Amino acid sequence: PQITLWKRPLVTIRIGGQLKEALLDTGADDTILEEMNLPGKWKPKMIGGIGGFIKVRQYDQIPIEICGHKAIGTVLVGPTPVNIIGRNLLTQIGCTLNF
């Protein structure tokens, strides 16, 4: 689709058969989701945002369907104010900015 920006670009994602609302976030290098259980090995990582650094769990090769577009990539799980889809997955589903 084409998505305008008068509203937050919130979209439904499917991950592990669960549906969640997430923010398409071009300012985010990485995809970070609120606390949840994902399977497989994870690695402790730290990441910085506007307010400082947080600790996250990094899961690799996780499938997520974003608006019915399939991605498979790195998902961080941690204390984010909202689920965010970052450029690592935005690129896989072919997302660009246009003006």
Place this chain on the structure above:
Amino acid sequence: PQITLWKRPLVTIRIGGQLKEALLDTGADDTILEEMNLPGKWKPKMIGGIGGFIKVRQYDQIPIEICGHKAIGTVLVGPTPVNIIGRNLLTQIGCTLNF
């Protein structure tokens, strides 16, 4: 133009004859720029993201030129590591997300 998300979507902005590099950020409600001394009235605000909150100054009706496109609106100024063009001005320059 069309901006891919392989790299950070940094573009040149102009604010009162200072040129700066800024993120076109669909995950940011409002534009926030690095510490700088804008003229006129402002109000204190806290904005929250990854890692917590920072204190900022909200200036209203500030003209910014973004890649040659004219915008005028709310500009928050505070201790951000990156300059961020948020949805409040992205809409004015005609910026959409597409996939």
